[PDB]
Amino acid sequence: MKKILFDVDGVFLSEERCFDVSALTVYELLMDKCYLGLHSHIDWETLTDNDIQDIRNRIFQKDKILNKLKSLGLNSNWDMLFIVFSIHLIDILKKLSHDEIEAFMYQDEPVELKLQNISTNLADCFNLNEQLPLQFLDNVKVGKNNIYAALEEFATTELHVSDATLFSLKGALWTLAQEVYQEWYLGSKLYEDVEKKIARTTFKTGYIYQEIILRPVDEVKVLLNDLKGAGFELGIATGRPYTETVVPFENLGLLPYFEADFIATASDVLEAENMYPQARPLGKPNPFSYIAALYGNNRDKYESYINKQDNIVNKDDVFIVGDSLADLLSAQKIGATFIGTLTGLKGKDAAGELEAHHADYVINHLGELRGVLDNLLEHH
């Protein structure tokens, strides 16, 4: 009867690795002889947590580039790594003759292979200048669509051309960069099964298995266990797709504490939208996934999860544990008790918005969750 719905990022795991893979993507697209092959580089198959950190640091410049893209509306890692890599590409292309440019920009061969024919035409040694992308966003209007427009105008004026559709969103180049990231993340094996494409490498194991933990698993395995011991039913609602949720939890040993029928993911919202397109977006602000994680995750009940959301549960029967504000509104929506965590990307600085939104409780991290359950009224 009593259920407690959990969110994944900002609670159990963080999103850092995404920014890591995003960095490694740009870097691999720059040094590997499979693409540009600008300069030498460490063997990908032997990278360490420090190498990756250094790479990320160089590419994003202490995350300055990474945080600027956020403030402008670019929160998708695929989009971020794409824009950052285009700025450097355009930079390298302005060193070749106009003829060489039109070649790479208009040749019938795939960009992936056309990238392999640029380094040989470099007169002098090219210098990276990893500050360019940041000095690119300087004057750019907020908004993904707007960001892509600036990137296109920049390419035309810099490369003295008029097309620049190669840099278009979801373009051939965008597809390349995005495939490189997915293999980096899911790993070759999971890449083929999820993306339905043949893997480029055979050494990428997938950083999905080396996800950044927020709280020691051995400690949460006891918390979850006791939670069940107190008659609590557990549930999961995340913005992560199916695999990015199951695989990590599986490898970590947390999955056994969550019934597969009570784990709602971005795949479900995606599926639900295809069945009921005019049902607007069923994204995280919409309590749909939380509702699916509560009553059960079966296609045949989706419609009800969409039409019946206003105060469908009592305050003492459901406890939503998350860090985002979008989860807070989903709880106030369905009538569930909300308990916010301070383990989000913003850290504890997110406490002000949580209290200004009347969050039932606010905890520092998943561990301090016992205090709330043993002091529901005391700490009310």
Tab-separated table of C-alpha atoms in Angstrom:
chain	number	residue	atom	x	y	z
A	1	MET	CA	0.000	0.000	0.000
A	2	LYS	CA	2.590	2.584	1.101
A	3	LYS	CA	4.949	3.403	-1.733
A	4	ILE	CA	8.073	5.491	-2.149
A	5	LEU	CA	8.979	6.595	-5.648
A	6	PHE	CA	12.639	7.367	-6.385
A	7	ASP	CA	14.326	9.422	-9.086
A	8	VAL	CA	17.703	8.287	-10.418
A	9	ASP	CA	19.924	11.220	-11.314
A	10	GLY	CA	20.441	13.585	-8.423
A	11	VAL	CA	19.561	10.785	-5.988
A	12	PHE	CA	21.421	7.524	-6.623
A	13	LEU	CA	23.626	8.511	-9.570
A	14	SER	CA	24.908	11.776	-11.012
A	15	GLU	CA	25.077	13.016	-14.609
A	16	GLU	CA	28.816	13.796	-14.546
A	17	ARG	CA	29.786	10.804	-16.686
A	18	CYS	CA	27.561	12.239	-19.421
A	19	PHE	CA	29.689	15.391	-19.514
A	20	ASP	CA	32.744	13.093	-19.429
A	21	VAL	CA	31.640	11.017	-22.406
A	22	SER	CA	30.589	14.257	-24.084
A	23	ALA	CA	34.196	15.505	-23.640
A	24	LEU	CA	35.739	12.215	-24.813
A	25	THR	CA	33.532	12.365	-27.877
A	26	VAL	CA	34.808	15.739	-29.047
A	27	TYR	CA	38.357	14.621	-28.249
A	28	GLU	CA	38.104	11.311	-30.139
A	29	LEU	CA	36.629	13.124	-33.118
A	30	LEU	CA	39.706	15.350	-33.011
A	31	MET	CA	42.776	13.163	-32.416
A	32	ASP	CA	41.808	9.741	-33.720
A	33	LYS	CA	43.168	8.851	-37.133
A	34	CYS	CA	39.685	7.381	-37.765
A	35	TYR	CA	38.391	10.941	-38.153
A	36	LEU	CA	40.515	14.099	-38.095
A	37	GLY	CA	43.623	12.702	-36.423
A	38	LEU	CA	44.985	16.156	-35.617
A	39	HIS	CA	47.715	15.062	-33.194
A	40	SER	CA	48.861	12.061	-31.107
A	41	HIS	CA	46.754	10.881	-28.229
A	42	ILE	CA	46.565	8.310	-25.470
A	43	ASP	CA	45.168	4.858	-26.251
A	44	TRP	CA	41.408	5.053	-25.698
A	45	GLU	CA	41.350	1.517	-24.372
A	46	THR	CA	43.686	2.487	-21.528
A	47	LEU	CA	42.043	5.716	-20.293
A	48	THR	CA	41.866	6.354	-16.518
A	49	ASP	CA	39.512	8.427	-14.378
A	50	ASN	CA	42.246	11.073	-14.409
A	51	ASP	CA	42.870	11.062	-18.191
A	52	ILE	CA	39.147	11.550	-18.825
A	53	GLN	CA	39.117	14.327	-16.265
A	54	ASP	CA	42.031	16.046	-17.907
A	55	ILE	CA	40.431	15.708	-21.330
A	56	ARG	CA	37.130	17.126	-20.052
A	57	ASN	CA	39.015	19.948	-18.418
A	58	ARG	CA	40.816	20.839	-21.648
A	59	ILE	CA	37.786	20.539	-23.941
A	60	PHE	CA	35.328	22.456	-21.730
A	61	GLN	CA	37.880	24.734	-19.999
A	62	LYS	CA	37.064	23.949	-16.372
A	63	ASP	CA	33.480	23.367	-17.473
A	64	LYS	CA	33.095	27.034	-18.373
A	65	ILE	CA	31.982	26.027	-21.910
A	66	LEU	CA	29.834	23.278	-20.388
A	67	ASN	CA	28.016	25.685	-18.050
A	68	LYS	CA	27.537	28.382	-20.699
A	69	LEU	CA	25.658	25.937	-22.946
A	70	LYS	CA	23.364	25.227	-20.006
A	71	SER	CA	22.511	28.874	-19.358
A	72	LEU	CA	21.664	29.214	-23.074
A	73	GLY	CA	19.215	26.314	-23.200
A	74	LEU	CA	21.491	23.508	-24.407
A	75	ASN	CA	21.082	20.719	-21.887
A	76	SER	CA	21.316	17.795	-24.307
A	77	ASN	CA	24.794	16.234	-24.275
A	78	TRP	CA	24.517	15.262	-27.945
A	79	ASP	CA	23.848	18.878	-28.912
A	80	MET	CA	26.573	20.220	-26.608
A	81	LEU	CA	29.384	17.982	-27.858
A	82	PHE	CA	28.246	18.678	-31.424
A	83	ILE	CA	28.452	22.488	-31.141
A	84	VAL	CA	31.803	22.326	-29.336
A	85	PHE	CA	33.229	20.044	-32.014
A	86	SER	CA	31.884	22.203	-34.856
A	87	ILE	CA	33.642	25.316	-33.525
A	88	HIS	CA	36.955	23.488	-33.734
A	89	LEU	CA	36.095	21.952	-37.079
A	90	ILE	CA	35.236	25.341	-38.574
A	91	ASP	CA	38.500	26.590	-37.010
A	92	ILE	CA	40.591	23.920	-38.753
A	93	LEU	CA	38.698	24.427	-42.032
A	94	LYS	CA	39.629	28.109	-42.143
A	95	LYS	CA	43.258	27.016	-42.538
A	96	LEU	CA	42.696	25.234	-45.875
A	97	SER	CA	42.128	26.776	-49.316
A	98	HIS	CA	38.579	27.572	-50.351
A	99	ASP	CA	38.855	24.673	-52.794
A	100	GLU	CA	39.768	22.166	-50.098
A	101	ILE	CA	36.858	23.500	-48.042
A	102	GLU	CA	34.187	23.046	-50.695
A	103	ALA	CA	35.539	19.513	-51.045
A	104	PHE	CA	34.912	18.476	-47.458
A	105	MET	CA	31.691	20.509	-47.440
A	106	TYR	CA	30.196	19.160	-50.673
A	107	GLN	CA	31.849	15.820	-51.527
A	108	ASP	CA	29.412	12.916	-51.994
A	109	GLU	CA	31.396	10.789	-49.539
A	110	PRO	CA	30.287	10.599	-45.881
A	111	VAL	CA	31.662	13.307	-43.552
A	112	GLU	CA	33.202	10.612	-41.413
A	113	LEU	CA	35.536	9.715	-44.282
A	114	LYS	CA	35.831	13.306	-45.507
A	115	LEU	CA	37.215	14.241	-42.095
A	116	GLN	CA	40.145	11.901	-42.782
A	117	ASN	CA	41.293	14.132	-45.643
A	118	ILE	CA	41.847	17.446	-43.883
A	119	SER	CA	44.966	17.020	-41.739
A	120	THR	CA	47.073	16.181	-44.807
A	121	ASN	CA	46.310	19.614	-46.305
A	122	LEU	CA	47.419	21.593	-43.244
A	123	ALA	CA	50.320	23.847	-44.212
A	124	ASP	CA	51.498	24.555	-40.687
A	125	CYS	CA	50.950	22.704	-37.454
A	126	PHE	CA	47.387	23.497	-36.336
A	127	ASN	CA	46.938	24.676	-32.711
A	128	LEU	CA	43.707	23.636	-30.950
A	129	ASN	CA	42.716	26.869	-29.161
A	130	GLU	CA	40.182	25.230	-26.819
A	131	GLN	CA	38.814	28.620	-25.850
A	132	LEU	CA	37.251	29.341	-29.259
A	133	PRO	CA	33.868	27.677	-28.553
A	134	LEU	CA	33.505	29.773	-25.396
A	135	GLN	CA	34.464	32.910	-27.313
A	136	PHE	CA	31.828	31.804	-29.801
A	137	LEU	CA	28.853	31.852	-27.415
A	138	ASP	CA	29.824	35.359	-26.236
A	139	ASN	CA	26.909	36.897	-28.120
A	140	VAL	CA	24.285	34.210	-28.754
A	141	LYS	CA	20.567	34.443	-27.913
A	142	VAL	CA	19.244	31.841	-25.488
A	143	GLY	CA	17.455	28.950	-27.192
A	144	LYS	CA	18.591	25.719	-28.829
A	145	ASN	CA	17.164	26.749	-32.208
A	146	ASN	CA	18.974	30.108	-31.877
A	147	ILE	CA	22.247	28.429	-30.913
A	148	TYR	CA	22.145	26.298	-34.062
A	149	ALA	CA	21.467	29.410	-36.135
A	150	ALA	CA	24.538	31.186	-34.725
A	151	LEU	CA	26.650	28.103	-35.428
A	152	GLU	CA	25.454	28.119	-39.050
A	153	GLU	CA	26.013	31.842	-39.627
A	154	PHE	CA	29.474	31.491	-38.112
A	155	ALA	CA	30.388	28.704	-40.518
A	156	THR	CA	29.190	30.652	-43.589
A	157	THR	CA	30.991	33.888	-42.662
A	158	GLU	CA	34.171	32.106	-41.510
A	159	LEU	CA	34.355	29.573	-44.329
A	160	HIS	CA	33.114	32.162	-46.845
A	161	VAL	CA	30.392	29.825	-48.066
A	162	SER	CA	26.582	29.918	-48.138
A	163	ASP	CA	25.393	26.355	-47.514
A	164	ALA	CA	26.610	25.261	-44.046
A	165	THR	CA	23.793	22.670	-43.828
A	166	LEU	CA	26.415	20.114	-42.844
A	167	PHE	CA	26.259	21.667	-39.363
A	168	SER	CA	22.472	21.332	-39.231
A	169	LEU	CA	20.788	19.738	-36.240
A	170	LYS	CA	20.285	15.971	-36.600
A	171	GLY	CA	22.515	16.291	-39.670
A	172	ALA	CA	24.979	13.744	-40.998
A	173	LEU	CA	27.744	15.228	-38.826
A	174	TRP	CA	25.347	15.412	-35.866
A	175	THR	CA	24.500	11.740	-36.382
A	176	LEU	CA	28.196	10.839	-36.439
A	177	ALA	CA	29.062	12.671	-33.231
A	178	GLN	CA	25.999	11.243	-31.584
A	179	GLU	CA	26.891	7.668	-32.576
A	180	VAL	CA	30.394	8.114	-31.196
A	181	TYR	CA	28.971	9.248	-27.877
A	182	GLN	CA	26.500	6.370	-27.651
A	183	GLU	CA	29.199	3.760	-28.222
A	184	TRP	CA	31.362	5.529	-25.662
A	185	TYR	CA	28.482	5.395	-23.180
A	186	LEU	CA	26.552	2.167	-23.847
A	187	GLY	CA	29.637	0.363	-25.078
A	188	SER	CA	29.942	-1.582	-28.343
A	189	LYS	CA	27.654	-4.461	-27.316
A	190	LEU	CA	24.751	-2.389	-25.944
A	191	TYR	CA	25.301	0.117	-28.764
A	192	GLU	CA	24.391	-2.429	-31.459
A	193	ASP	CA	21.361	-3.679	-29.523
A	194	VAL	CA	20.016	-0.244	-28.577
A	195	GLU	CA	21.023	1.829	-31.591
A	196	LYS	CA	20.584	-1.076	-34.042
A	197	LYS	CA	23.879	-0.160	-35.697
A	198	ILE	CA	27.214	-1.955	-36.047
A	199	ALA	CA	29.875	-0.897	-33.551
A	200	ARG	CA	32.835	1.107	-34.745
A	201	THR	CA	35.245	-0.241	-32.121
A	202	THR	CA	35.759	-3.412	-30.074
A	203	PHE	CA	37.439	-1.859	-27.042
A	204	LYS	CA	34.650	0.407	-25.739
A	205	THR	CA	33.143	-1.297	-22.683
A	206	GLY	CA	30.699	1.482	-21.859
A	207	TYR	CA	30.948	4.044	-19.086
A	208	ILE	CA	27.379	3.083	-18.255
A	209	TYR	CA	29.064	0.458	-16.103
A	210	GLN	CA	31.291	3.047	-14.410
A	211	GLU	CA	28.550	5.478	-13.465
A	212	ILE	CA	29.344	8.090	-10.789
A	213	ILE	CA	27.724	7.055	-7.513
A	214	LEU	CA	26.263	9.689	-5.194
A	215	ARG	CA	26.050	7.446	-2.123
A	216	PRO	CA	28.035	4.247	-1.291
A	217	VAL	CA	25.938	1.398	-2.677
A	218	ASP	CA	26.616	-0.892	0.287
A	219	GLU	CA	25.035	1.831	2.470
A	220	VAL	CA	21.950	2.320	0.269
A	221	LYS	CA	21.461	-1.440	-0.050
A	222	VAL	CA	20.769	-1.446	3.708
A	223	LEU	CA	18.486	1.589	3.509
A	224	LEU	CA	16.426	0.086	0.690
A	225	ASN	CA	16.305	-3.256	2.491
A	226	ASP	CA	15.012	-1.720	5.730
A	227	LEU	CA	12.609	0.432	3.705
A	228	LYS	CA	11.057	-2.794	2.458
A	229	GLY	CA	11.271	-4.187	5.976
A	230	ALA	CA	8.995	-1.350	7.106
A	231	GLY	CA	6.314	-2.442	4.661
A	232	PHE	CA	7.384	-0.052	1.909
A	233	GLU	CA	6.984	-0.751	-1.789
A	234	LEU	CA	9.728	0.838	-3.917
A	235	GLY	CA	9.431	2.518	-7.324
A	236	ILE	CA	11.477	4.362	-9.989
A	237	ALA	CA	10.621	7.320	-12.288
A	238	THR	CA	13.529	8.804	-14.287
A	239	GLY	CA	14.245	10.793	-17.440
A	240	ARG	CA	16.809	8.172	-18.428
A	241	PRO	CA	15.841	5.631	-21.098
A	242	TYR	CA	15.372	1.934	-20.261
A	243	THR	CA	18.929	0.720	-20.668
A	244	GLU	CA	20.561	3.723	-19.003
A	245	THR	CA	18.444	2.855	-15.955
A	246	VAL	CA	18.422	-0.954	-15.807
A	247	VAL	CA	22.065	-1.678	-16.757
A	248	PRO	CA	23.547	0.733	-14.192
A	249	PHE	CA	21.287	-0.410	-11.342
A	250	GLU	CA	21.853	-4.004	-12.414
A	251	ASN	CA	25.667	-3.749	-12.389
A	252	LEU	CA	25.493	-1.961	-9.018
A	253	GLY	CA	23.214	-4.468	-7.304
A	254	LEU	CA	20.295	-2.114	-6.687
A	255	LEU	CA	17.894	-3.565	-9.242
A	256	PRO	CA	16.850	-6.433	-6.917
A	257	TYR	CA	15.143	-3.793	-4.704
A	258	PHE	CA	12.919	-2.559	-7.531
A	259	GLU	CA	10.231	-4.610	-9.294
A	260	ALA	CA	10.538	-4.298	-13.063
A	261	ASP	CA	6.845	-3.362	-13.325
A	262	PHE	CA	7.392	-0.326	-11.132
A	263	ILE	CA	10.244	1.300	-13.024
A	264	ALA	CA	9.065	4.101	-15.304
A	265	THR	CA	11.604	5.565	-17.743
A	266	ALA	CA	11.916	7.961	-20.680
A	267	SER	CA	11.212	5.012	-22.946
A	268	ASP	CA	7.748	4.622	-21.444
A	269	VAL	CA	6.880	8.309	-21.874
A	270	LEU	CA	8.171	7.943	-25.416
A	271	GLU	CA	6.014	4.904	-26.007
A	272	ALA	CA	2.976	6.486	-24.353
A	273	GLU	CA	3.277	9.561	-26.596
A	274	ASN	CA	3.253	7.456	-29.751
A	275	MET	CA	-0.022	5.798	-28.694
A	276	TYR	CA	-1.553	9.130	-27.691
A	277	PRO	CA	0.300	11.824	-29.681
A	278	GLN	CA	-2.242	14.581	-29.017
A	279	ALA	CA	-1.612	13.896	-25.329
A	280	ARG	CA	0.992	16.641	-25.499
A	281	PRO	CA	4.373	15.875	-23.904
A	282	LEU	CA	4.385	13.314	-21.097
A	283	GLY	CA	7.808	14.446	-19.901
A	284	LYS	CA	8.975	14.587	-16.266
A	285	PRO	CA	6.943	17.664	-15.342
A	286	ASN	CA	3.903	15.512	-16.169
A	287	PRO	CA	3.286	12.949	-13.346
A	288	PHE	CA	2.713	10.181	-15.920
A	289	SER	CA	5.926	8.288	-15.208
A	290	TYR	CA	5.417	8.591	-11.470
A	291	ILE	CA	1.874	7.292	-11.944
A	292	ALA	CA	3.183	4.370	-13.996
A	293	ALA	CA	5.774	3.588	-11.329
A	294	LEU	CA	3.028	3.575	-8.724
A	295	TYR	CA	0.181	1.501	-10.180
A	296	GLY	CA	2.152	-0.576	-12.670
A	297	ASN	CA	3.945	-0.124	-15.960
A	298	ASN	CA	1.651	-1.649	-18.559
A	299	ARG	CA	0.749	-0.116	-21.941
A	300	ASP	CA	-2.910	-0.906	-21.314
A	301	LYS	CA	-3.079	1.488	-18.392
A	302	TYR	CA	-1.231	4.423	-19.898
A	303	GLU	CA	-4.347	6.323	-20.951
A	304	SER	CA	-5.550	6.311	-17.367
A	305	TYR	CA	-2.175	7.559	-16.176
A	306	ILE	CA	-2.683	10.535	-18.507
A	307	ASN	CA	-6.312	11.409	-17.712
A	308	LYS	CA	-6.278	10.736	-13.948
A	309	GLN	CA	-3.527	12.752	-12.270
A	310	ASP	CA	-5.126	15.353	-9.993
A	311	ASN	CA	-4.894	14.286	-6.332
A	312	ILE	CA	-5.257	10.554	-6.952
A	313	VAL	CA	-3.319	9.516	-3.838
A	314	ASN	CA	-3.236	10.327	-0.137
A	315	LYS	CA	-0.349	12.288	1.331
A	316	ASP	CA	0.697	9.365	3.560
A	317	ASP	CA	0.643	6.635	0.953
A	318	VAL	CA	3.214	7.918	-1.536
A	319	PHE	CA	6.576	9.612	-0.945
A	320	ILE	CA	8.434	10.951	-3.967
A	321	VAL	CA	12.206	11.218	-3.461
A	322	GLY	CA	13.963	13.468	-5.915
A	323	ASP	CA	16.054	16.550	-6.374
A	324	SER	CA	14.465	18.337	-9.311
A	325	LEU	CA	11.671	20.813	-9.014
A	326	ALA	CA	9.837	19.068	-11.868
A	327	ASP	CA	9.401	16.105	-9.493
A	328	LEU	CA	8.140	18.357	-6.719
A	329	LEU	CA	5.260	19.645	-8.880
A	330	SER	CA	4.481	16.060	-9.976
A	331	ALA	CA	4.044	15.134	-6.307
A	332	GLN	CA	1.983	18.203	-5.407
A	333	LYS	CA	-0.029	17.284	-8.533
A	334	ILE	CA	-0.979	13.687	-7.677
A	335	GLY	CA	-1.190	14.486	-3.976
A	336	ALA	CA	1.932	12.656	-2.799
A	337	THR	CA	4.367	13.708	-0.092
A	338	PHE	CA	7.521	15.227	-1.554
A	339	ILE	CA	10.992	14.949	-0.074
A	340	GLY	CA	13.789	16.785	-1.870
A	341	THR	CA	17.458	15.806	-1.906
A	342	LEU	CA	20.395	18.187	-2.117
A	343	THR	CA	22.430	15.882	-4.335
A	344	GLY	CA	21.555	17.534	-7.669
A	345	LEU	CA	24.011	19.208	-10.058
A	346	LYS	CA	23.313	22.494	-8.226
A	347	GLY	CA	24.256	20.835	-4.934
A	348	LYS	CA	22.687	22.389	-1.842
A	349	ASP	CA	22.152	25.740	-3.572
A	350	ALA	CA	18.865	24.197	-4.744
A	351	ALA	CA	17.436	24.391	-1.220
A	352	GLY	CA	15.985	27.871	-1.686
A	353	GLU	CA	13.818	26.952	-4.673
A	354	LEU	CA	12.639	23.783	-2.891
A	355	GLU	CA	11.443	25.672	0.162
A	356	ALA	CA	10.016	28.479	-1.974
A	357	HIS	CA	7.964	25.716	-3.639
A	358	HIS	CA	6.686	24.290	-0.349
A	359	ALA	CA	8.625	21.031	-0.382
A	360	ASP	CA	7.303	18.748	2.356
A	361	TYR	CA	10.856	17.885	3.433
A	362	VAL	CA	14.384	18.627	2.336
A	363	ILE	CA	17.243	16.200	3.010
A	364	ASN	CA	21.000	16.523	2.341
A	365	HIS	CA	21.243	13.101	0.708
A	366	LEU	CA	19.544	9.715	0.340
A	367	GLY	CA	21.001	8.676	3.693
A	368	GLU	CA	19.182	11.291	5.748
A	369	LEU	CA	15.941	9.765	4.467
A	370	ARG	CA	15.394	7.822	7.692
A	371	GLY	CA	15.075	11.076	9.621
A	372	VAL	CA	12.049	11.992	7.551
A	373	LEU	CA	10.309	8.650	7.940
A	374	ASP	CA	10.865	8.539	11.697
A	375	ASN	CA	9.915	12.187	12.123
A	376	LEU	CA	7.062	12.690	9.668
A	377	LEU	CA	5.234	14.966	12.103
A	378	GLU	CA	8.182	16.065	14.269
A	379	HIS	CA	10.034	17.480	11.252
A	380	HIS	CA	6.850	18.498	9.380
